[PDB]
């Protein structure tokens, strides 16, 4: 993984030694080249994962997440460079450094072969993310949002640390390859009930689980656009990725420990989809959409079947590109009208035609229109949940109805109707903004042609 | 095989080329609408060759060209079933779309976005052809939701109009509720048969098919707008008239019935499903025809006619006659698309007037539109030997000679009578009597685009039913022995509807005022179903979304029980710890207490 | 041709000979001749050209052979080096078995289409072979979970073998 | 608008004897 | 090498350096080169190691 | 109150540069930024990367498995063996408890 | 209610005539019953007692509600009509032309020359319009939404730009 770690580090000297007018050009160009070379990770085998060294490995689960992570850094740079234009030059370089350092922790987190190394990097992402939100957010509430983000994560992470060290003491290793062969079943006891909870609660908070999701509407709304892009696209997937790995060592106790959390998710998604129908803030609406989608990922991981793991992996990738695109779409409006209120600016399809096409395409992927990989993932999860219990089709079906209503409600309210008369600064969409939109949607729609590379290890 | 397989794919590939040209900036947007129309005409010609081969020898094949994805033991390939249903629906759908597109060149001439309109119409068609030739359920779903989304985009064509956006979202909402059943059927077939392929489903022939077929029926209830999920179809009249003609003859509304036809090998053995569909069809056909009796919007009258005709198709499914139901789809496409294009001709000539009460005296002023309207009306009512007669008449006499629910049969017969009544309403109020429209006369039906497009569908509404019936192979045992009163039932009740309708119509000309009856308001206001359901259900759901889900739980109780309580305790503990007097005497007095309890209570000294 | 006829069988083709009982000309006959001249012929020449280029550059690729290693039954417990090879082998055989069930399912689907309205009786052999293979596949691999392994497969087999012993003990 | 930064009212929260 | 474009070699060189260091890692993990039951064979007359 | 700057006015990039691409105020930097995004994003990663993915060598050996399965089916049907046995492991190598 | 008794009776008259027209349909039948309805209104035209007049109006409204058409005729472009807001998607505000690229503006050199004159006329009049409104408005703001005309030569009626330059009813 050094062929990605080292060049990712070299982005930092590149940004700091660039001419004052080339920091965005240079960093964007070279983060795209790193993104290109990440495709070499798709040398995957049917039986064996790609094991580079004692420290890092890649498999069909981590590979697509790595490719998404390295692709997002260029997109976060283009999204940021407009609202940071007036920023002091050295503070601009520091902002880029936080994004680069976040990428470095992410690509190592998704490939660390030992769970305690995963834990340290899993936790190291808090620092740059917290700094990005609190330093470069716009509102007063960004300070409170950082505190909620920090302590919701840590309240779950600290028990995980104790559990992992306990597992290493008793098993003798936390290397994930070793855990595949030395795993022993977990027999019922109050001691093991709390080992299970400590192994799963840190990842549930990151997803987030319904009930523990309050940090996300605050954090995903107060953050600058780049912060929201990474929070929705990747950082939420640390929870899903972590669960997918650690559930190996939790069987068969997951049989009955999953019930309270499946209930929170099945009912949670219907609750958080319904919330989106009455949201007045466009960014808040998108954030609550992420909770609804990640509820399916939680259920798919917990029921633990070959189809649900394929569906969970597809959903995580598809949601990352969609949710990131929606935040970017809403940001373009915000950079014009300086407000997140959804009803403020209406009938925008009349004033910004092409950008209304992106809104439509983003909305269709969100409501899981076939054969998008959003539908592929969402359908595979529904297939496996039906087998788990047929009655779940009722809750999945209702959520699919509600999701279409709020996806098209957001499209109709902002893009259709009559334009607001007094808003007269809707300038035509910039090339940067159009390209930023097409760099989400085009890769997302291309993956439909070859969906096997985003279905994970159980394909 | 080489020509049959090759030609049946160029048809589908031909229709995507205008889409590729538009999306890839390689077109002369001079006359893009003509380009799209020309491509459809050529697709129709190439689609006839495979159909003629099927007519000759019954040649059918399945093409599984592209292997897309293998999920363990579920291989998913891009497949196309070129069978009886595909080879007859496609040329009919293309032929009807050929007329609608030529008609729309005249009807949408003034639209600044006519090019985009023709692109959306072509996508609407492509998603329907994907649906109709799909060989596995996943490919079917792609087209199933494709037509649903194109319907959303076209119904809400005039997006500045709040009513068009409400109607468009209504169509998605009602069709998404139906899609729950589609997803249910897919999950059951995958779990119990390990397949989404139609061939394996029929080979394994599940015996306990209640659950998958109930899901399929629910999907058909939404797409075909049967009672319960019906209000969206009349509301879809918000769209431009060309949308209504295409959305009602081909494409959307017929997909629900087509899905049940495709699964007749299962339904033909499950009696309990037959009863449900029969009763679902019978209430739909009766209820919607009753609604059309008092409508004054011409598009809504024709819209409720489609709902009543689709209900009739569901009845045909309910009596185990899938092939007659398919025949009605094909024949219905001709005269129903013609009727909508005739109403569009009237609406255009009267400056977008749609109320029949402001028409009148158009019999002689619009002679060609009049002729097509009368031919379309007579075909709809089962006039002997017109296109409608070759499906509807066989359906009625197959339904009164079956082992069937008696209420469903009786309700179906009354609906046939009601069909002649609302049909008479359009002719009496639009064509006959004295003109009731504004004084600046602008009637003009002399554009060749208008004439030729309707003329082709007029020839279809006369002979297409005769041609199709005499070329399709037999697949049942037509029941041709029955008492005289069962043979002529459809013909008689239709005539009684015309006579009763004429007396009712002529009594509007008397100088007598009569207070509305309760039944008149029930019919006019659509049984109050939209008035109640579309206020009550949105209110309860939307109020819960805000009051409970968002306010009570997310902004209060989930905050209160964790972050707000935890942080409050820490603040209180901090003030207890730090609120001290800074007095040496008190701190050292506390040292003595600590040492004492350390020994007396905890024995730290032992 | 290109695939093995034994793996993918197809009954002999029996096309009836034309027996026109009409004086009219058959439109399909002249359309077929036009198709051969305007489509098949130029397409065939373009292919024959391409095949002339592929014959000038002839090179080979091979089907990987995997030698058999000891199964997880022969592995001492917690001996990762032997467990790894047995586990990798078990995963290779799992994927192959998935493709075997796909071959049998593809035979079954081809028969159903080929036999038309007589499929219910003319595809009884393919139905039976599909039923047997699906039963075997279910026994090997069903209910193992997302974290399946050779170890879990062995435990499932032992549980099944124990029940079979007990049922016989009843006899 | 522009990014919010603490004003005098906010800053005096941290100027007292105790929090 | 110009005064205006030397910064554009930092990331390409990091990739080359990272690629190189990855290969040197593979040289510390040769304990089972040509020794696994699945792939153990003989060395071709001219060959030195099965994989480097 | 206090001594504070008023909120600066909004700057529309199109007034100074009608041909603005939205990247930079400097027209020359603005053009270069658009060039690198499009060339490296669309021409390199998306076009070549899509081509790379399409020609991946037998991703996760699904094609070898189909070839291998055909070989097994041919051999087993010719020799009269069952296509697939219920037992994954040979029961002679298993020692049941009790 | 801010409508006088006269305005309520006159409104009820028109509304009842329209609903009567929806029941009758045929023009001759409508003319016959429109005159009978007019006779009823003329029968109490001179009622002087406001209390008795109001009671008559109350009953007439109750009778109208009982006898109204459940589906009355609506002009296509009237609120609720089938063409209402049909062309709102084609109405683009004039300020959008300021963002046009110069190569787009060069296609209509004459149109944008006139447009500049209108914008010049808007700037040079704005101050007088504000001043006129200030000096004609009583303290505590206006009591009505009415606006004054211009009182001088060259003065434009205050707050005219968005009335004069509003989109055409059929823009495309
Ligand atoms: C390998 C490397 C390849 C790279 C990737 C190649 C693809 C990208 C091509 C880039 C160049 C394309 C281009 O020049 O754009 C010209 C093209 C035509 O120019 P235009 O007429 O001025 O468009 C301006 C309006 O915004 C146009 O707005 P519009 O509404 O008129 O049309 C835009 C269209 C968006 O594009 C489309 O979807 C077209 C229809 C699909 C094809 O929106 C829709 O039609 C929404 C409905 C889409 C159909 C969904 C129904 C379900 C069908 C599912 C079946 C799937 C079977 C497979 O512009 C666009 O439409 C932009 C869209 C770019 C995204 C493509 C999305 C494809 C889906
Ligand atoms: C015309 C009819 C209408 C159909 C709609 C048009 C679509 C079909 C046209 C295309 C037909 C050609 C075709 O499909 O072949 C393509 C083929 C699929 O068909 P194939 O599998 O048979 O491949 C053909 C080549 N052989 C025969 C050797 C296998 O390949 C692909 O699909 C390319 C995959 C592209 C996906 C890669 C995305 C780029 C990744 C960039 C990284 C950053 C992105 C973000 C990261 C996200 C996480 C991963
Ligand atoms: C349920 C399914 C849901 C599907 C959802 C996704 C829909 C996306 C839209 C699909 C677009 C149409 C797809 C069919 C067209 C062919 C696609 C293709 O890439 O063909 C390559 C073909 C693949 O070979 P195959 O064994 O079938 O499968 C490999 C596994 N990927 O390899 C070949 O056979 C070689 C073909 C070579 C043809 C040469 C002729 C070129 C002539 C010039 C053309 C310009
Ligand atoms: C979101 C929070 C979710 C909370 C989920 C709650 C799950 C509750 C799991 C309860 C089962 C725990 O597992 C259970 O532990 C007790 C330990 O006392 C074990 O039992 C042991 O102690 C009990 C005493 O109470 C004795 O009856 C028993 O003889 C002894 O073996 C059981 O053999 C085991 O079945
Ligand atoms: C926040 C939402 C809250 C919603 C309420 C959710 C309640 C969830 C309760 C957690 C599960 C408790 O119930 C749990 O059931 C499983 C069986 O399925 C038991 O599982 C255990 O007992 C069964 C038999 O009872 C044995 O086969 C075996 O020893 C073991 O599986 C657990 O011992 C018990 O603890
Ligand atoms: C995988 C695809 C396989 C097939 C590829 C074949 C590509 C050949 C593309 C040829 C041109 C297609 O794109 C377009 O075609 C039509 C018909 O010629 C032309 O359109 C022309 O004819 C039509 C009708 O005859 C007129 O409505 C139109 O005014 C006129 O410009 C366009 O000018 C051309 O840009
Ligand atoms: C399957 C298709 C079947 C199509 C059947 C078509 C209609 C069949 C005939 C219906 C009844 C014919 O109409 C019968 O004769 C004349 C019309 O000529 C009507 O006579 C009417 O003429 C005038 C119209 O100018 C009316 O105002 C008057 O109230 C009435 O006397 C009778 O009231 C009616 O009883
Ligand atoms: C659920 C598992 C993990 C949960 C762990 C949660 C621990 C708490 C994390 C957030 C800590 C924030 O700590 C503090 O919280 C309160 C509200 O909560 C905020 O205070 C805000 O709300 C309180 C009360 O609602 C108001 O009195 C106050 O005016 C307002 O500023 C503080 O600005 C913040 O400093
Ligand atoms: C599962 C384990 C979870 C561990 C979570 C980590 C705990 C961190 C504790 C932080 C404690 C400090 O948090 C403290 O909360 C109170 C909430 O009343 C805030 O206080 C706020 O609300 C109170 C009343 O609601 C007001 O009197 C006060 O003016 C206001 O500032 C403090 O501003 C904040 O400093
Ligand atoms: C395999 C790795 C490949 C990495 C490729 C990375 C590509 C990055 C492209 C950035 C190109 C910028 O290259 C640019 O060139 C010109 C002269 O050469 C320099 O100099 C120019 O700057 C100013 C801009 O204000 C110009 O007006 C002027 O013409 C010139 O002085 C720029 O300062 C430099 O920014």
Short mmCIF file of C-alpha atoms in Angstrom, two decimals, chain A residues 43-295:
data_model
loop_
_atom_site.label_atom_id
_atom_site.label_comp_id
_atom_site.label_asym_id
_atom_site.label_seq_id
_atom_site.Cartn_x
_atom_site.Cartn_y
_atom_site.Cartn_z
CA UNK A 43 -6.26 -7.47 -8.93
CA UNK A 44 -8.60 -9.58 -6.83
CA UNK A 45 -8.76 -13.37 -6.70
CA UNK A 46 -11.71 -15.65 -6.14
CA UNK A 47 -10.24 -17.37 -3.09
CA UNK A 48 -7.43 -15.26 -1.62
CA UNK A 49 -7.39 -11.59 -0.74
CA UNK A 50 -4.50 -9.40 -1.90
CA UNK A 51 -2.08 -9.47 1.04
CA UNK A 52 0.79 -7.04 0.54
CA UNK A 53 2.71 -7.28 3.80
CA UNK A 54 2.32 -7.85 7.53
CA UNK A 55 0.56 -4.48 7.81
CA UNK A 56 -1.78 -4.02 4.84
CA UNK A 57 -4.08 -6.16 2.71
CA UNK A 58 -6.84 -5.51 0.20
CA UNK A 59 -9.93 -7.54 -0.60
CA UNK A 60 -13.09 -6.95 -2.60
CA UNK A 61 -14.59 -5.14 0.40
CA UNK A 62 -11.80 -2.64 1.00
CA UNK A 63 -10.86 -2.19 -2.66
CA UNK A 64 -14.03 -0.34 -3.80
CA UNK A 65 -14.01 1.76 -0.63
CA UNK A 66 -10.38 2.70 -1.28
CA UNK A 67 -11.17 3.65 -4.86
CA UNK A 68 -14.08 5.79 -3.70
CA UNK A 69 -11.90 7.48 -1.07
CA UNK A 70 -9.12 8.46 -3.47
CA UNK A 71 -11.64 9.62 -6.07
CA UNK A 72 -13.36 11.91 -3.57
CA UNK A 73 -10.27 13.95 -2.70
CA UNK A 74 -10.09 15.62 -6.14
CA UNK A 75 -13.83 16.28 -6.00
CA UNK A 76 -13.61 17.82 -2.53
CA UNK A 77 -10.92 20.21 -3.79
CA UNK A 78 -13.03 21.54 -6.67
CA UNK A 79 -16.04 21.88 -4.39
CA UNK A 80 -14.06 23.89 -1.84
CA UNK A 81 -12.00 26.32 -3.87
CA UNK A 82 -14.83 28.79 -4.47
CA UNK A 83 -15.86 29.54 -0.89
CA UNK A 84 -12.22 29.59 0.27
CA UNK A 85 -11.17 32.12 -2.38
CA UNK A 86 -10.96 35.02 0.08
CA UNK A 87 -9.20 32.84 2.66
CA UNK A 88 -5.65 33.62 3.71
CA UNK A 89 -3.10 31.72 1.63
CA UNK A 90 -1.53 29.75 4.48
CA UNK A 91 -4.96 28.88 5.85
CA UNK A 92 -5.91 27.61 2.39
CA UNK A 93 -2.87 25.33 2.42
CA UNK A 94 -3.77 24.04 5.89
CA UNK A 95 -7.31 23.28 4.72
CA UNK A 96 -5.94 21.18 1.86
CA UNK A 97 -3.55 19.51 4.29
CA UNK A 98 -6.45 18.37 6.47
CA UNK A 99 -8.12 16.79 3.44
CA UNK A 100 -4.89 15.06 2.43
CA UNK A 101 -4.26 13.84 5.97
CA UNK A 102 -7.83 12.57 6.10
CA UNK A 103 -7.26 10.59 2.90
CA UNK A 104 -4.06 9.14 4.34
CA UNK A 105 -5.84 7.86 7.44
CA UNK A 106 -8.70 6.50 5.34
CA UNK A 107 -6.67 4.49 2.84
CA UNK A 108 -4.67 2.97 5.68
CA UNK A 109 -7.82 2.36 7.75
CA UNK A 110 -9.48 0.37 4.97
CA UNK A 111 -6.35 -1.75 4.42
CA UNK A 112 -4.92 -2.28 7.91
CA UNK A 113 -4.65 -6.02 8.46
CA UNK A 114 -4.58 -5.80 12.28
CA UNK A 115 -7.69 -4.60 14.11
CA UNK A 116 -5.83 -2.42 16.63
CA UNK A 117 -4.06 -0.66 13.76
CA UNK A 118 -7.51 -0.23 12.23
CA UNK A 119 -8.73 1.22 15.52
CA UNK A 120 -5.97 3.83 15.73
CA UNK A 121 -6.55 4.99 12.16
CA UNK A 122 -10.31 4.66 12.54
CA UNK A 123 -9.94 7.14 15.41
CA UNK A 124 -7.30 9.33 13.76
CA UNK A 125 -9.87 10.51 11.21
CA UNK A 126 -11.67 12.39 13.99
CA UNK A 127 -8.95 15.02 14.26
CA UNK A 128 -8.91 16.39 10.67
CA UNK A 129 -12.69 16.02 10.40
CA UNK A 130 -13.24 17.91 13.66
CA UNK A 131 -10.85 20.68 12.60
CA UNK A 132 -12.52 21.01 9.20
CA UNK A 133 -16.00 21.33 10.72
CA UNK A 134 -15.17 23.75 13.53
CA UNK A 135 -12.53 25.90 11.82
CA UNK A 136 -14.13 26.30 8.39
CA UNK A 137 -17.84 25.93 9.06
CA UNK A 138 -19.97 29.03 8.61
CA UNK A 139 -22.41 29.11 11.54
CA UNK A 140 -22.24 29.47 15.30
CA UNK A 141 -23.59 25.94 15.68
CA UNK A 142 -20.47 24.41 14.12
CA UNK A 143 -18.80 24.47 17.54
CA UNK A 144 -21.61 22.44 19.11
CA UNK A 145 -21.67 20.15 16.08
CA UNK A 146 -18.00 19.32 16.57
CA UNK A 147 -18.57 18.39 20.21
CA UNK A 148 -21.47 16.08 19.35
CA UNK A 149 -19.44 14.49 16.56
CA UNK A 150 -16.45 13.97 18.84
CA UNK A 151 -18.16 12.55 21.93
CA UNK A 152 -20.74 10.38 20.19
CA UNK A 153 -17.88 8.64 18.40
CA UNK A 154 -15.59 8.39 21.42
CA UNK A 155 -18.32 7.17 23.76
CA UNK A 156 -18.55 4.09 21.56
CA UNK A 157 -14.90 3.84 20.53
CA UNK A 158 -13.44 3.61 24.02
CA UNK A 159 -15.37 0.41 24.89
CA UNK A 160 -14.26 -0.98 21.52
CA UNK A 161 -10.62 -0.40 22.48
CA UNK A 162 -11.03 -2.44 25.66
CA UNK A 163 -12.86 -5.20 23.79
CA UNK A 164 -10.18 -5.47 21.09
CA UNK A 165 -7.36 -5.65 23.63
CA UNK A 166 -9.32 -8.29 25.54
CA UNK A 167 -9.74 -10.27 22.31
CA UNK A 168 -6.00 -10.07 21.65
CA UNK A 169 -5.20 -11.24 25.18
CA UNK A 170 -7.45 -14.29 24.89
CA UNK A 171 -6.96 -15.17 21.21
CA UNK A 172 -3.34 -14.00 21.01
CA UNK A 173 -3.75 -12.02 17.78
CA UNK A 174 -5.81 -9.30 16.16
CA UNK A 175 -4.51 -9.88 12.63
CA UNK A 176 -7.59 -10.39 10.50
CA UNK A 177 -6.19 -13.34 8.54
CA UNK A 178 -5.44 -15.13 11.81
CA UNK A 179 -8.93 -14.37 13.11
CA UNK A 180 -10.37 -16.19 10.10
CA UNK A 181 -8.78 -19.48 11.19
CA UNK A 182 -8.54 -19.13 14.98
CA UNK A 183 -12.10 -17.86 15.50
CA UNK A 184 -14.09 -19.61 18.22
CA UNK A 185 -17.85 -19.39 18.83
CA UNK A 186 -19.24 -16.98 21.40
CA UNK A 187 -21.34 -18.79 24.01
CA UNK A 188 -24.12 -17.07 25.91
CA UNK A 189 -23.18 -15.14 29.03
CA UNK A 190 -23.64 -11.63 30.40
CA UNK A 191 -19.89 -11.22 29.91
CA UNK A 192 -20.22 -11.96 26.19
CA UNK A 193 -23.32 -9.80 25.79
CA UNK A 194 -21.15 -6.80 26.68
CA UNK A 195 -18.20 -7.94 24.61
CA UNK A 196 -20.62 -8.04 21.68
CA UNK A 197 -21.96 -4.57 22.46
CA UNK A 198 -18.47 -3.10 22.85
CA UNK A 199 -17.50 -4.59 19.49
CA UNK A 200 -20.55 -3.19 17.68
CA UNK A 201 -21.54 0.09 19.33
CA UNK A 202 -18.63 2.13 17.97
CA UNK A 203 -19.53 1.05 14.45
CA UNK A 204 -23.26 1.63 14.97
CA UNK A 205 -22.67 5.23 16.06
CA UNK A 206 -20.69 5.87 12.88
CA UNK A 207 -23.34 4.43 10.56
CA UNK A 208 -25.36 5.92 12.32
CA UNK A 209 -27.85 3.67 14.08
CA UNK A 210 -31.28 5.15 14.60
CA UNK A 211 -31.38 6.51 18.13
CA UNK A 212 -27.66 7.30 18.05
CA UNK A 213 -27.90 9.45 14.92
CA UNK A 214 -28.36 12.90 16.44
CA UNK A 215 -24.74 13.89 15.81
CA UNK A 216 -25.12 13.49 12.06
CA UNK A 217 -27.82 16.05 11.19
CA UNK A 218 -25.79 18.59 13.18
CA UNK A 219 -22.39 17.63 11.78
CA UNK A 220 -23.45 17.06 8.17
CA UNK A 221 -25.18 20.46 8.13
CA UNK A 222 -22.62 22.68 9.88
CA UNK A 223 -19.64 21.37 7.93
CA UNK A 224 -18.18 23.08 4.87
CA UNK A 225 -19.06 21.41 1.60
CA UNK A 226 -15.89 19.32 1.49
CA UNK A 227 -16.48 18.20 5.07
CA UNK A 228 -20.00 17.08 4.20
CA UNK A 229 -18.81 15.26 1.08
CA UNK A 230 -16.34 13.11 3.01
CA UNK A 231 -18.61 12.67 6.04
CA UNK A 232 -21.45 11.27 3.95
CA UNK A 233 -19.47 9.39 1.33
CA UNK A 234 -16.70 7.69 3.33
CA UNK A 235 -16.71 8.32 7.07
CA UNK A 236 -20.17 6.80 7.49
CA UNK A 237 -18.76 3.73 5.74
CA UNK A 238 -16.10 3.22 8.41
CA UNK A 239 -18.99 2.03 10.56
CA UNK A 240 -20.25 -0.35 7.90
CA UNK A 241 -16.77 -1.59 7.02
CA UNK A 242 -15.93 -2.15 10.67
CA UNK A 243 -19.09 -4.15 11.31
CA UNK A 244 -18.51 -6.29 8.22
CA UNK A 245 -15.10 -7.31 9.59
CA UNK A 246 -15.75 -7.76 13.31
CA UNK A 247 -18.96 -9.77 12.96
CA UNK A 248 -16.69 -12.67 11.97
CA UNK A 249 -15.71 -13.15 15.63
CA UNK A 250 -19.19 -12.62 17.10
CA UNK A 251 -21.02 -15.71 15.98
CA UNK A 252 -23.35 -17.27 16.90
CA UNK A 253 -24.24 -14.57 19.43
CA UNK A 254 -25.25 -12.23 16.59
CA UNK A 255 -28.34 -14.44 16.20
CA UNK A 256 -30.10 -12.82 19.15
CA UNK A 257 -27.99 -9.71 19.79
CA UNK A 258 -29.03 -8.34 16.39
CA UNK A 259 -32.73 -8.15 17.26
CA UNK A 260 -32.79 -4.80 19.12
CA UNK A 261 -30.68 -3.19 16.39
CA UNK A 262 -32.61 -4.69 13.47
CA UNK A 263 -35.76 -3.27 15.05
CA UNK A 264 -34.16 0.15 15.47
CA UNK A 265 -33.14 0.07 11.81
CA UNK A 266 -36.28 -1.33 10.20
CA UNK A 267 -38.42 1.16 12.10
CA UNK A 268 -35.70 3.79 12.06
CA UNK A 269 -35.61 4.07 8.28
CA UNK A 270 -39.36 4.63 8.10
CA UNK A 271 -39.02 7.26 10.81
CA UNK A 272 -36.10 9.03 9.14
CA UNK A 273 -37.64 8.85 5.68
CA UNK A 274 -40.80 10.44 7.08
CA UNK A 275 -38.71 13.16 8.71
CA UNK A 276 -37.37 14.12 5.28
CA UNK A 277 -40.91 14.91 4.11
CA UNK A 278 -41.19 17.79 6.60
CA UNK A 279 -37.61 19.11 6.54
CA UNK A 280 -37.21 22.83 5.95
CA UNK A 281 -33.42 22.80 5.46
CA UNK A 282 -32.13 21.26 2.24
CA UNK A 283 -28.85 20.05 3.74
CA UNK A 284 -30.70 18.65 6.75
CA UNK A 285 -33.05 16.79 4.41
CA UNK A 286 -30.10 15.17 2.64
CA UNK A 287 -28.50 14.24 5.96
CA UNK A 288 -31.64 12.48 7.16
CA UNK A 289 -31.71 10.65 3.83
CA UNK A 290 -28.32 9.14 4.70
CA UNK A 291 -29.70 7.77 7.98
CA UNK A 292 -32.54 6.09 6.11
CA UNK A 293 -30.20 4.45 3.59
CA UNK A 294 -27.61 3.36 6.15
CA UNK A 295 -30.37 1.65 8.14
#
